[PDB]
What does this fold into?
Amino acid sequence: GAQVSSQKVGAHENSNRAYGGSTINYTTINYYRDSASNAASKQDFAQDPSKFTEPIKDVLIKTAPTLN
Amino acid sequence: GAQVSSQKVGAHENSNRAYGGSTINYTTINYYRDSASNAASKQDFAQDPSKFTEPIKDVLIKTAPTLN
Amino acid sequence: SVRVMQLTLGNSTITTQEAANSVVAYGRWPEYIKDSEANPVDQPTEPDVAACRFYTLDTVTWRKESRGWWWKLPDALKDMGLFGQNMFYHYLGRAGYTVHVQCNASKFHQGALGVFAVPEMCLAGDSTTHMFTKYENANPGEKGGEFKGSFTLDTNATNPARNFCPVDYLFGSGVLAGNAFVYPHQIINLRTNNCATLVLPYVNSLSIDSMTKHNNWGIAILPLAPLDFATESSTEIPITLTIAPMCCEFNGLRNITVPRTQ
Amino acid sequence: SVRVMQLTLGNSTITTQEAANSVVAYGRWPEYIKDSEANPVDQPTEPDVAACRFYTLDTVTWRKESRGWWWKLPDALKDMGLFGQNMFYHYLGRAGYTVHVQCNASKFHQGALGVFAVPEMCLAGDSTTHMFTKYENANPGEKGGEFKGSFTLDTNATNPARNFCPVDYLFGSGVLAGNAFVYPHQIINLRTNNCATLVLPYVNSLSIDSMTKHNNWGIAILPLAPLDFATESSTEIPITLTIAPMCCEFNGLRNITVPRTQ
Amino acid sequence: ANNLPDTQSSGPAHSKETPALTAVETGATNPLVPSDTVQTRHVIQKRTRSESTVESFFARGACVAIIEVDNDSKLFSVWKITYKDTVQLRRKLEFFTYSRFDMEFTFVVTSNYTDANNGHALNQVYQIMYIPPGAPIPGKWNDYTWQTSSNPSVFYTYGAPPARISVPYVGIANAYSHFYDGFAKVPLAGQASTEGDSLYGAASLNDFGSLAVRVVNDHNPTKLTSKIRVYMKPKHVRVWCPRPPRAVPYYGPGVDYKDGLAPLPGKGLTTY
Amino acid sequence: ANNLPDTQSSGPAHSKETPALTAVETGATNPLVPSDTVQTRHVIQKRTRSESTVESFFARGACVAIIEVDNDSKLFSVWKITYKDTVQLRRKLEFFTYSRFDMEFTFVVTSNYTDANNGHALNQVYQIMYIPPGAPIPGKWNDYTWQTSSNPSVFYTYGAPPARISVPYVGIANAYSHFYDGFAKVPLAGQASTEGDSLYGAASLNDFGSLAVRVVNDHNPTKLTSKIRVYMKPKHVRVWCPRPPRAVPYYGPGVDYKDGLAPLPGKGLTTY
Ligand SMILES: COc1ccc(OCc2ccc(COc3c(Cl)cccc3Cl)cc2)c(Cl)c1
Ligand SMILES: COc1ccc(OCc2ccc(COc3c(Cl)cccc3Cl)cc2)c(Cl)c1
It folds into this structure.
């Protein structure tokens, strides 16, 4: 039940282990039945800001005149 | 997600385990997502000192006259 | 074009020749409750055309000295035809809205109105007692309320007003008004448009709620650039508010609710 | 449309909402010297973005009594940032230009400005001595010069002015101004447009020349229909001139040139 | 939590497309990038928004309460669960109208002798009992309620690493409401003014219950005080409807204000 | 971190190749080996440079600060983060101009009664809060800043193994600069001398922020002092541009010197 993800290496050691292998991976295993007990995975996604930045009914191009 | 490397055995015990097998290997597993949390692998490479010892434009042979 | 539109809901139609597009809040169009998000088990009532139509609330007048106006939904529509009837006869109710604010002037007038639709628009009170505003004052109905230029604490201990004291630059809630642009909005700049149109989906942490106890949306109108004309220190232009509920569905029918007033 | 544009050169952008198209002189867009037309053999410098950008020269004011204005290129840009530096450090220089003249008013104003780009715009002097205008007077820089309504001969023999005397209807050179339309131009008629935009290629009888000794283009602005407003005998509207050199390449680098002044 | 787009090189322009001009009346923000208004070079973008994700923004244990017990009714204390007793976490949560997450609670317990030269006590054990709305609240530091046959309790031994427990999403709605524009009651026509009156913006009188804390050891005449600092961290976070942040000082559980109403300093219009 | 080459046997020579002669004016070092100037035997080399790798050279926890707090404003202390408060680690880092690495911080906490026969206190808990440049700095050992809703804090219980945390590469440049030949400001022509003046070799006024340390327990009239010794170890190390090491005593954060300017002893030219 182990989950193996890879790390985003910031500072690199003068090793090939700093660039590949299990040496740039980390392992995770959940010990509790309730999902609330789990830690945060932090592999979180993003989205389009459009719902806030452009909640416009009739879609407009920036090059084209906004007021038409 | 375990990384298995081999050790450089210095003092040898009067065992065959001191010369082979998993007995001369060591195991590693990363527990943290951030690479900063990782220990140092210490399997570090070397390089050519030439950039410091001979930062000369026109490469010269030691047997051959330096001033030509 | 971006400027000419026609909105038809039920037996009511609205036309405009100077629009600046329309905003659909959070990019969500109003919808009915899906079976996977349903909660009350009884068969809902959906008045449809009888409730989902354009209702024109009272016209307010904009002057150089105006600070702003506010309304609460569904509150402002509680006395509107069959929408109000269904609201009071049912324990639970849900609806989206099409808010159409109207304000025309001339080519020699200036001014800009910021029209904001705020989910859970909680306003600040007038006393040192927290959350002291009483039901009757929090729910003015179609006449709504107004913003003030400053905070004035009610000190009458014998007869506390128990009312709101929404200061304009503090957006009536302790936040800076310039940041209110994070909420769905449009601007009625007199040199550009006649109106502002916002389509609001139902927003809440539940699929359906009590319309009498809870107001889902708040409409705030603030003069971003004050009204000015030719040389007439004296200038007044009306601001009419027309709102249409959408996808109305009610649950929990019983005897009619008659709330306490004034 | 013919009326809305945006020009971007280097770190500068110009927008207009009331254009009347743009003119590309003689249908030629500026370009660099080709190897088949090359003359100086040394490697050229091409500042690119540092020199080819929009520089705004001083704003002049148009009144009912104005006769006209004139500028010389590259002269008017000699003190403009890194363009001026490269001009003075090199013996030879070549450049094209994008001239953008700006002039906005209102719907109750009238007037028309003729904007002409003239190759080898030689102007008439003020004395009986031929070709007597001195270098310092012929090269005013960014402030340019003005047209006059009549010719007035300089008679001070002790201290001759040695200046130009450009009469407006004679186009400052002994030709009738109405025929100046044979030169690339645009008209800023207040009831139609805000500006005039002209793209000028390098014009000369050589591929490259001395920018300090020789002015390739001349910009002449004449009020074709005088400025008039409502009933205000008093009316002033500014005319701003923004020019951007294009495809600059210099040859013959040495110590900097410091020309004599005033 | 990802990458940002590269900057593409952009040259000069002379066209009828004018991205610089717009009309903010529509309610939209102009999506311009540098190359729209200036000449740009190609830049390979390596910066990411990994730390500004909704999760990383809240992934910190914030203090929400400091419960105090004097082991010489103060032999036990009760804290009504809330996030509004402190200001820092509260302000961050209020950037949004609704939220849904799990919670991690860490308890830092400290104690000391009030007297510099008097008294002595053996190591203390604390009991932190959660009393869900409805359960009997302790009247004495040692009454029957502390049997916890159903209420969750945490027994902490002084000196041990801070205690820590996780709580699931416990709301009775599909999300937690940071703002509730309404009342729990509707006053009906005809009833006395005392009737149907409730607080504005309040839901249940007892939303999440409270914590009852006590020292389990028999109290000695020695003067001792203990403090339990409660730290809470939202994990597995989802938030809805952004709102402008609090600009003036908080004045209670509501959006009420009173004091620091002039937050901005003076600065000349033409002063850099 | 590897092997050294074997020595190959070398016999006598009588040739026109003269590796012994050179010209150091070129800026190069003569790469001779023993067999170039003497007769050598074959030696199979087994020694390696495993311990002199850049990583192994720095793989040690060095003390960079000793923060002191007196639990009877001294109830809390603030330490501006730096590696220049001590000399040993600083000198090693300065063998290079630039560096890039992660950091491991270990905190050794000690405490004691000032009085041999007076006072008593229960076990102490410490809070080590990191205040990034910009965050509010504590004014009192117990003001709102200690809520740490966003700042990273470490709560240490006295007597527990030393606390330890890791920090990523946090520089705003692509590498840390051990030397900065410049200023943060350029004085412009015309401005008052008070204007545009800044320290030579200084970048930001607040590079990495600081640490705020306090004892969380309520202070007792007893006289107590605690010291937090901060140990830092660079891990995942990369360094650029070697420099000669510091020969004379340090005199501040800069390369300034004043006192021990005559480091070398006397020795006869012809004395072994
Ligand atoms: C929108 O932001 C929110 C929403 C809900 C919150 O509190 C809900 C809540 C409900 C129950 C418990 C009970 O948790 C505990 C238990 Cl079982 C055992 C021991 C100790 C605790 Cl501590 C704790 C918090 C908070 Cl603090 C912020
Ligand atoms: C070239 O050599 C260098 C470069 C940078 C350095 O310091 C950078 C630095 C930045 C932030 C922190 C903050 O670290 C901490 C945190 Cl998050 C939490 C708790 C405690 C600490 Cl301690 C610590 C050090 C040092 Cl010491 C040497």
Summary: The domain at 1-68 of chain A is CATH 4.10.80.10 (Rhinovirus 14, subunit 4). The two ends of chain A are 58 Å apart (CA to CA). The pocket of SC4 (ligand 2) is lined by residues F 64, 81, 83, 93, 99, 103, 105, 128, 130, 152, 154, 165, 167, 170, 176, 208, 211, 232 (CB under 6 Å). The longest helix of chain A spans residues 50-53.
